[PDB]
Amino acid sequence: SYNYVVTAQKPTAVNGCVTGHFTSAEDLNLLIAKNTRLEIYVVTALRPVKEVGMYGKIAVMELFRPKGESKDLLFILTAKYNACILEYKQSIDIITRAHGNVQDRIGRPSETGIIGIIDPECRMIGLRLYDGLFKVIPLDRDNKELKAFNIRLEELHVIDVKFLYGCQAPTICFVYQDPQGRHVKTYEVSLREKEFNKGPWKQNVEAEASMVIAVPEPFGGAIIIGQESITYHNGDKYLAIAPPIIKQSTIVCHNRVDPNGSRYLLGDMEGRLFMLLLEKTLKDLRVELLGETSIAECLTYLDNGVVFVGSRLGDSQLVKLNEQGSYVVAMETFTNLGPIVDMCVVDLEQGQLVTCSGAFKEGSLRIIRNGIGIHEHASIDLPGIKGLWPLRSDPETDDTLVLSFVGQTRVLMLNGEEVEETELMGFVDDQQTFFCGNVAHQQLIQITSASVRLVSQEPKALVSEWKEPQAKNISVASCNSSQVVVAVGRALYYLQIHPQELRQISHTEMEVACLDITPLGLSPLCAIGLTDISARILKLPSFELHKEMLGGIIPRSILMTTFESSHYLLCALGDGALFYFGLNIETGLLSDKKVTLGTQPTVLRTFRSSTTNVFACSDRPTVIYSNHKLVFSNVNLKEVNYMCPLNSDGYPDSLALANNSTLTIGTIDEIQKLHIRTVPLYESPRKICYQEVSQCFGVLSSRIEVQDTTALRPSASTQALSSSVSSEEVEVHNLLIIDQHTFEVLHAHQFLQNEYALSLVSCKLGKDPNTYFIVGTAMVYPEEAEPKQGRIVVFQYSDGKLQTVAEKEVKGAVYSMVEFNGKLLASINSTVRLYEWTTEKELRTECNHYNNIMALYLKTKGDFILVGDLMRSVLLLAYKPMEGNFEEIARDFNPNWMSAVEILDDDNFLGAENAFNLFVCQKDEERQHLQEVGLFHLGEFVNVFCHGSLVTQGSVLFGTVNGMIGLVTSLSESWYNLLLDMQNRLNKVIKSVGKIEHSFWRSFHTKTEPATGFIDGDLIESFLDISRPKMQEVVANLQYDDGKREATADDLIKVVEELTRIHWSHPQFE
Amino acid sequence: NFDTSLPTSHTYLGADMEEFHGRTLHDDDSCQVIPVLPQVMMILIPGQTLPLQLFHPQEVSMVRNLIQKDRTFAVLAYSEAQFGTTAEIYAYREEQDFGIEIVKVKAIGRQRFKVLELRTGIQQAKVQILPECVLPSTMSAVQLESLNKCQIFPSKPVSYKWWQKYQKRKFHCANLTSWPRWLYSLYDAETLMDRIKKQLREWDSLPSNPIDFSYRVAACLPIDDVLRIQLLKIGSAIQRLRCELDIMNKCTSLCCKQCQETEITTKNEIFSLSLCGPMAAYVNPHGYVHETLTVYKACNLNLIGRPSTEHSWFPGYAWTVAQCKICASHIGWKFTATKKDMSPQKFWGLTRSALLPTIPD
Ligand SMILES: Nc1cccc2c1CN([C@H]1CCC(=O)NC1=O)C2=O
């Protein structure tokens, strides 16, 4: 087994955020870490400037100015202990001044995590990585390899450490704990002796003190934040406030507002933003409650009272802080999918992904679709529109929109952004219009069912009319700049346009449901669609045929059009099908190529956006292009019946969209993009699944209430339309029923007090026509470590109500459930149990399997069952229908924290495991032993795998703690070998930011072993961005595969591009 | 009472042994060839102490040379053998009085290994070292950096709200993952160790490192040769502690291994006469090793012969052979006091190979 891993959505959650002068000495920059990405903005009255990617989880990131340097440099430390110093260069390079791996062979990582600090005089970086030691990297010009030395620390449990300002030597101030309590101490770092010296001072602080803040150089000293107290120290001055306004929570992030250090910003664990003030020398401290922001991970003050709130649990923000007493207000929001805690796919057959994102007040549903978006500028309430045409009341740019309804036509004039209904003289408005628009010889044309009306421009009048010789009803019309071809049921006529007259030319007969005459001035070619169900081509004046047949529903729309400079003919079916044939401009023959778009009949229009594209209206509206092949591309809108181009003094290069009850005028995005809809829930969503017949999602969610019992704010689950029940912080679990179109919370069921809802599933069972939501619960008591009771509840959502159709009590927790061949497969504690769904409407245990491991994870394919636990033990099982029984097939105990598993195929299992790794186990007596055929250091913590389709063999998507969405797919041995060569050759060529070897990065990590059986598609795709000579460098010794030969840059360019097309494209940063 | 440190110092073996500061470990996954001593049968656990008495010149050669200077031989779990444990000699006396050579040694189990091949009357085993699998906390991977500062707590008073507190603060970031605090709690070394402590307290400190703790209670647990091979197979401290909690809840009664369905004693009766635990390994005079378990009460046993202090593993007590009333199969010994001032006036010592733990009902 050989797999391709690629990112479909880069991590959105903010790890860290710093300001300073990096781009230029003059600029002020905001630097934001998103795991392995680093965004660089310039602050203004934010302009994105440059984004780069480490081969590394960014774990430390600080700006600092070395003596006699003109702008700040940047220190990064990665989770794998890759250090570096980086410099911005203006097109734009980030260069490596210094780098090296600061790992130690020995060393227990400290419980309080990695801590990086740079002293104020920029003498050194001080690193706290392990208990007992303090690593020091001298910042000397000539330390390009960041070689360093350690100093012994008597104190083994250090909570937090900072250098101080205004000292006669570099000085660290730190909070530590021992048996007698918690204390602050200071040490002087003797540059000469390379050792700690007795510090300026020390002091038993608050029990729960945890945050050190070094105050700048008027007052100097240190501030210590705890649970109830904020305390200041310097020499032997000492200030202590314990305000009530910080009683309620825990201060976990901070940041300095001004150089002085007069003010600090402080972030709660729960959303509160405080300001701390030092009052003046230093005489008192005061805290003020600014208000609520996203739950903050990091804060940066920018300028003009604007603040960046970096979030992990929610959206990150820009907040403006504005007598009337201090307040903060939200300016901007930045999307975070982070904690992707579970997800599911809607339209597996478009295709949209739904996630359970965020936590506590940040909890949300994210709906994610790829597609071309539309900015709407205007909406008009007009029901029943059956056609749209742009038009030009005066000889420059459209100013007239003509709309038709059933046996009716209406005209709308456009003045800037104000639309006014008028009368067009010469235009009959009692029939339904089939075509109208501008024509040759300074004229205008209306083709109704009754007649064909030529109209002049200057004083508008009906100059010429044409009707059938027998005054019959026209069935289909087609007209271009200078010609008309109208069909009348049985036979059709060709007409021209000359000044003041439209005189006939041909009068043919047919053996007709649509016409076309788009010139590729005068088009000597004609497109037709006829019980004969074919797309027929005819010569002009002549009418004498080529042909093609389509068989099967009558065709609705037909179009001749030119993409690139190649020519096509397009025919759209009344069942929703679309056929695209190649064309012959002079010859007439057609060839090739089909696609379905949506069962509602399709309508095709031309528009320009330098070249020509085609809009396709139907249940799913679609834009078409292009590069000499043609492409499907969904439009981010619910159905649009009709469209036309509109270019006005008010709406330039815009669009008019009409559906059943509304006309919309809008501009249309150039490129595709990811459209994320956010459904705030104000509580933690935990599971989601999609019930298509009920056209709604089920979402398990919990909320935090506090004791006498009441909620902290309005939630999804407290604001449902209908709600039911089963009848120090606590957890209250609910099943939400969220509508699929309007995202209304239709119903909330609330589970029993102390009942924990663990798993969810939507399915049919046995011979029952219904679809059910099915929740797995567990009874959670504080006194009781091990779950001893739980429910399986079977709910049904009919009408507006959630009914309880059945219970099953179970002597433990229901960790997992999967629907299994019409039966229900549930893992309860260390048992795996299969249930039959009877006609008495009850779940009746068929069989039962005990394991050596707690069945946390359950996944199935066919008759195979994958069973797994937190510890990374996997068991393959086989339901034996003739035995009514289970059989253990294979097994593998290899102890590592495991977070998610998925079945790839009968023989292969994917899993995410400790230190952000992926592994693959393979089935192939004592071949009940599973083999480890793939390892890869991903860099993310995967919560959820699911089979899917974004738009290589098969497709598994994953969601992640940092909010990254990924894709995994299988490769044939041939492609794996090819791409493995390529990676290695691309590694020689591509410059990596901290000069970290790709190999080191992807190496499976906890122990360290090389990556294997995985291809980093993120790396492969960058092949497209290197210089032409570098592309050829790389393909020098590669065997491509036909029937093999030395591969060329062009063979690869097209290979990698096919590869980019299997996931969503990434947005440009700038 | 009596001096609880006496049984673990094996005073019945003689006066004095030259001691060796043990520092030889073989790095992980390696392939080593180690001597295997004849007629040693037991499953030895890392940290467990093993006393021996050797009479055959065969054996007496193997050790005499072992002393220089690996000092380690291999002990095998017999199913013959798939796995075992390295034992390193830390003390040794060689008596050749009356011209009869005896070698008495005290070894301690060091490393777990997988058997590859077994060649030969002294054995040498081809052996691959099994690594001790050490994992960070479940949370260290998903932990928000901002909350790092709170990961150290104020220490526990020498009181159950503290554990509710502990659970709430340590496993906070479960919310980032797809499971509850109380789950991650069931794989938390510190918690499990505590849950085990309370049971071990009913047999009344100990190691703080989970690896050690898990190996110390492993050697206390009276289970059967087939279950002992299971924990020995276990590579993780966490899975060792977990599986160990399971046995302590699930195995209340202890029966005759031979006739199977016959109750000798219960959990209630187990007590640590030895400092080390309710169970340690002891050698008899013919050099045979017995992991004997001290209990207060023991049912359905017959006593034959005369109470004797000869070579007694509990100075102060005399031993009488006890055997299963039903099958006659030798289950262990009854120990009686010789002084009328001693606490426990009697107790039963039951050999582990003779027992079968049962989950009654
Ligand atoms: N005398 C003799 C002969 C054969 C076997 C054994 C003995 C004595 N013994 C045990 C009896 C219990 C004790 O406290 N110390 C021992 O050494 C035996 O296991």
Ligand SMILES: [Zn+2]
């Ligand atoms: Zn018996």
